[model samples]
Target chain A: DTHLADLYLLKYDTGLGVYESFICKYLEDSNDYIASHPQKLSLDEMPRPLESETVSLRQLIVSVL
Target chain B: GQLDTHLADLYLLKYDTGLGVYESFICKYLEDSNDYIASHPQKMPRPLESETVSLRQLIVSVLP
Candidate 1:
């Protein structure tokens, strides 16, 4: 199975940008809480601040979970 | 650290985070700490799109 996810590492601030890094491609049993491994974001990629936007991380996380 | 020192809008309030172990998916980014210090919520997880667009669909709710 081929899987890859460049999930953003978001910080709660009034501003916005990107710098943190992490990339996931495989999902194991993911016990209670699996060890986190991440792939760095590309230079072109931008970090987003959870500010007045289309969606909020908390909202998203809650919705999905 | 360009981010505002004090928590403001769009910030996740200080609360226990454990809705369930099923899918609170996110690899918190940290360098010197592992806890919230007292305030501030951990980094939010943003899942990107893949070839199958599996999780991506949840993001778009559209396909055309």
Candidate 2:
């Protein structure tokens, strides 16, 4: 359970820095996803790129999903 | 935003935790969002729950 929380936190941290704009985009995208799909997205359902330290913090937005 | 208020109150509690305030803010925001989503399940992307920690406990855990 804690691991799930960690992953959730990581998702937001990695995809959206501590900025309001990123947070707004995140909330909006998830909201849109919920609206468009019949099924729900699990915490793990979100796609994460292969773990790579080379990724810059500024490019944290989830490009795949 | 600085964590002066939270840190000051936490310091008064004699907790020596040194976790960064930015990290704490992110954790707290996510936890609060989880709670909000729980109440508004329709708004959440997932049915996930968050681990809750008291301010004192969190501060203590951050201390080296």
Candidate 3:
């Protein structure tokens, strides 16, 4: 019942579906630390690296695109 | 609830492959980092021992 915004992903019909990770760092006191990494909850993950330009999905796409 | 000082409201677009749709939300931003923080809608549940709201965030709406 939610509107999953796909403004960026649905923009083009070509290029690739390669995913890029943004290891977003959070400040742990004085130093940077990554408590956890991003995960996917979709039925299917990315097709593959160097994938066709038809679809480009960052696993984080579910979170935001 | 009162507005938080550190968390800036950053609007973004979200996508769901399973359902095949797109939506928009105002996520919290921490200087372009730690984008995992955002406020939930009213009457929503909150997590324990959490400092920031845990609404998912997105930062890309680039043109092709």
Which residue pairs in model 1 clash with each other?
Answer: A17-A47, A18-A47, A22-A38, A22-A39, A23-A38, A23-A39
DockQ of each: 0.03, 0.04, 0.03
Question: Per-residue error at A50 for model 1, in Å?
Answer: 14
The top-ranked prediction according to lDDT is: 3
Question: Candidate 1's residue-wise lDDT over B1-64, tens digit each?
Answer: 3322211122111222356323323222223344444465643343333342223111201111
List model 3 lDDT by residue over A1-65, tens digit each.
44443223222343366544333322233432222212332222232222345444443222323
After aligning candidate 3 to the native by TM-score, how far in Å is the CA of A30 from where it should be? 35
After superposition, candidate 1 runs with Cα above 4 Å error? A14-29, A32-55, A58-65, B1-64
lDDT of 3: 0.34
Better of 2 and 3 by DockQ: 2
Q: Distance from true position, residue A45, model 3, in Å?
A: 10
Model 2's alpha-carbon lDDT is 0.27
Candidate 3 docking quality: incorrect, acceptable, medium or high: incorrect
Across B1-64, the per-residue lDDT of candidate 3 in tens digits comes to 5445544344332333345343333455445443334554641222121222133433444497
Per-residue lDDT of candidate 2, residues B7-37 (tens digit): 2222111222456432232222222333554
